[PDB]
């Protein structure tokens with residue numbers, strides 16, 4: 893199965909994840925209470941960030957192309973597609989942005 897290293901605030905561990913199991917679910921089953929809210933791809937609570945490897949997160953409904961290229965992942969709807977190293981609890985890192993903060 894793929895091996896996924898989850899790097900959390902409280903430590904790291906590496907676990908098996910099947911191709912048809914979402915990251916969040918695997919992590920929870922291995923004792924890691926990762927953040928989540930909606931569990932359906934429509935918020936940023938579960939965001940993680942890929943150090944290495946790939947996911948299938950086609951049901952994600954938050955992230956733009958930039959953000960995807962930066963390795964952001966909605967862990968509640970992400971299947972592994974390779975061995976992975978992922979940082980959890982990364983929502984701070986996602987810029988708020990908006991139409992009133994245009995950075996000049």
Ligand code: FES
Nearest residue numbers: 929931935938968
């Ligand atoms: S918990 Fe809302 S997108 Fe994952």
